Amino acid sequence: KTTLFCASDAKAYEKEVHNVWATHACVPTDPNPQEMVLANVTENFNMWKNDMVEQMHEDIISLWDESLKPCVKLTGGSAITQACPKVSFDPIPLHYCAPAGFAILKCNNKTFNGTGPCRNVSTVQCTHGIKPVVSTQLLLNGSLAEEEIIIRSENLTNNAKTIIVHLNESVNIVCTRPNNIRQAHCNINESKWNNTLQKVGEELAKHFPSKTIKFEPSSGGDLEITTHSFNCRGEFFYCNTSDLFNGTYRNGTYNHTGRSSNGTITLQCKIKQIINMWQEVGRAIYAPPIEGEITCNSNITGLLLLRDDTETFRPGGGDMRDNWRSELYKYKVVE
Ligand SMILES: CNCc1ccc2c(c1)N(C(=O)OCc1c(F)c(F)c(F)c(F)c1F)[C@H](CNC(=N)N)[C@H]2NC(=O)C(=O)Nc1ccc(Cl)c(F)c1
Ligand SMILES: *[C@@H]1O[C@H](CO)[C@@H](O)[C@H](O)[C@H]1NC(C)=O
Ligand SMILES: *[C@@H]1O[C@H](CO)[C@@H](O)[C@H](O)[C@H]1NC(C)=O
Ligand SMILES: *[C@@H]1O[C@H](CO)[C@@H](O)[C@H](O)[C@H]1NC(C)=O
Ligand SMILES: *[C@@H]1O[C@H](CO)[C@@H](O)[C@H](O)[C@H]1NC(C)=O
Ligand SMILES: *[C@@H]1O[C@H](CO)[C@@H](O)[C@H](O)[C@H]1NC(C)=O
Ligand SMILES: *[C@@H]1O[C@H](CO)[C@@H](O)[C@H](O)[C@H]1NC(C)=O
Structure with a gap:
């Protein structure tokens, strides 16, 4: 339809790189925006x-190119070298705004699965604030569904299509490299994981009804997708999820199968220098990790799944557009 613009609340005195990018690329935010219902x-x-x-994907690529420069970038035959300073990195929310003569329709059905007709609709100038958080397997720091866990898919019969599970209740995940400098670990409270996967198995069962529902760890691929990978405080964490996506839901009951301990699942993580890029097909080399305690305390707010009697779901990811989709699903640009 048109070219959106972004509004953010960043300040130009932050050294933090989302703030810097936003202060030259986005306009400040309307302190009181204005909605416009239309429930028929x-x-x-x-x-x-x-x-x-697509547009936000473009912007985030831009942001990462200006903020997280690699020491080396390998694409095609070429290798680019640049200065790769360690930086202050903590994503801020971004709003996408329709320019003059355009509006953004917002679907207000709190169970809308993301495709098809939506009953109650509003007009808005901008989307809510969206933290552009790059990760795989687990979606972090998003917006919870308001009613019940929601299964989203372009076509749930086509097992090659990513599934986005939209949780209605955060599950804490705490990842830390304490004070091997490249070793780290994540803690999730097993009870709340227990619970979340049981409710998820419920919903998945509605969609696949005769079958038991197995959660298993990602089969194969680059480390970036076979582990829960994400950027924390500038460093690239790769966290093993085999004790997380590991359980069966059979008789309206979830049984967790992955090893836990003292009531918490603990992911083993590596911090890595050589990265397969999400932006394009290519490799990117970064400097060794900063010093001291690197810790991110995040909210798991959704899942990225791939489906292989029984149906089996493993963690997926790799196409960062899906992350943006998970927040943008209820909006379109009109007129
Ligand atoms: C359904 N298929 C699943 C799947 C699995 C893995 C992947 C894809 C997709 N990809 C993908 O969609 O890229 C977008 C894309 C397009 F959308 C597109 F249309 C293109 F034409 C195109 F060129 C392109 F790049 C990545 C390719 N990039 C690579 N091989 N180097 C590959 N993801 C990754 O590597 C990855 O996430 N790394 C990573 C790094 C750091 C952090 Cl913190 C992190 F959290 C993750
Ligand atoms: C969330 O969704 C699940 C199933 O979809 C439901 O059991 C639960 O009550 C919903 N709301 C919560 C957990 O607050
Ligand atoms: C989403 O809803 C539409 C119509 O409401 C339906 O055709 C489609 O199969 C649903 N998809 C999922 C993944 O629930
Ligand atoms: C979903 O994909 C399957 C192929 O796996 C195919 O039957 C069809 O094209 C799609 N079905 C619907 C209802 O869109
Ligand atoms: C995760 O840990 C398990 C058990 O130690 C191991 O077998 C598996 O290969 C690991 N996965 C990755 C991607 O490192
Ligand atoms: C579940 O965890 C156990 C130990 O934690 C591991 O041996 C097993 O292989 C995991 N399940 C799968 C399907 O990998
Ligand atoms: C999620 O948000 C918290 C608070 O804003 C932040 O400390 C944490 O690092 C974020 N997680 C990621 C992966 O950016």
Whole structure:
């Protein structure tokens, strides 16, 4: 349809790189925006074919190119060298805004699965604040669903299509490299994981009804997708999730199978210098980790799954557009 613009609340005195990027690329935010209901209207959306996702993907690539420069970038035959200073890195929310003569329709159905017709609709100038958080397997620091866990997929019959599970209740995950400098670990409270996967198995069962529902760890691929990978405080964490995606839900009951201990699952993590890039097909080399305690305390707010009687789901990811989709699903640009 058109070219969106971004509004953020960043300040120009922060050294933090999302703030810096935003202060030259985004406009400040309307302190009181203005919505506009239309509960008879009913319009369709398709989260899987939504141009806003492409545009924000562009922006985040831009942000990362200006903020997290690699010492080396290998793409094609070429290798680029640049200065790769350690930086202050903590994502801030970004709002996407329709320019003059355009609006953003927001679907207000709190159970809207992301495709098809939506009953109650609003008009808005901008989306909510969206933290551009790059990760795999687990979606972090998003917006919880308001009613019940929600299964999203372009086509749930096509097992090659990523599934986005939208949780309604955060599950804490705490990842730390304490004070091998490249070793770290994550802690999740097993009870709340227990619970979350049981409710998720419930919903998945609604969609696949005769079958037991198995959670298993990612089969194969680059480390970036076979582990829960993400950037914490500038450093690239790769966390093993085999004791996380490991359990069966059979008789309306979830049994967790992965090893726990003292009531918490603990992921073993490596901090890594050589990265397979999400932005494009290529490799990126970074400097060794900063010093001291590197810790991120995050909210798991959704999952990225791939489906292989029984249905089996393993963690997926790799296409960062899906992350943006998970927040942008309820919006389209009109007029
Ligand atoms: C359904 N298929 C699953 C799947 C699995 C892995 C992957 C894809 C997709 N990819 C993908 O979609 O890239 C977008 C894309 C397009 F969308 C597109 F249309 C293109 F034409 C294109 F060129 C392109 F790059 C990545 C390719 N990039 C690479 N091989 N170097 C590959 N993901 C990653 O590597 C990855 O996430 N790393 C990583 C690094 C740091 C952190 Cl913190 C992190 F959290 C993750
Ligand atoms: C969240 O969703 C699950 C199942 O979809 C439901 O059991 C639960 O009550 C919902 N709300 C919560 C957990 O606050
Ligand atoms: C989403 O809803 C539409 C219509 O409401 C339906 O056709 C589609 O199969 C649903 N998809 C999922 C993944 O629930
Ligand atoms: C979903 O994909 C399957 C292929 O796995 C195919 O039957 C069809 O094209 C799709 N079905 C629907 C309802 O869109
Ligand atoms: C995760 O840990 C398990 C058990 O130690 C190991 O077998 C598996 O290969 C690990 N996965 C990755 C991607 O390192
Ligand atoms: C679940 O965890 C156990 C030990 O924690 C491991 O041996 C097992 O292989 C895991 N399940 C799968 C399907 O990998
Ligand atoms: C999630 O948000 C918290 C608080 O804003 C932050 O400390 C944490 O590092 C974030 N997680 C990631 C992976 O950015």
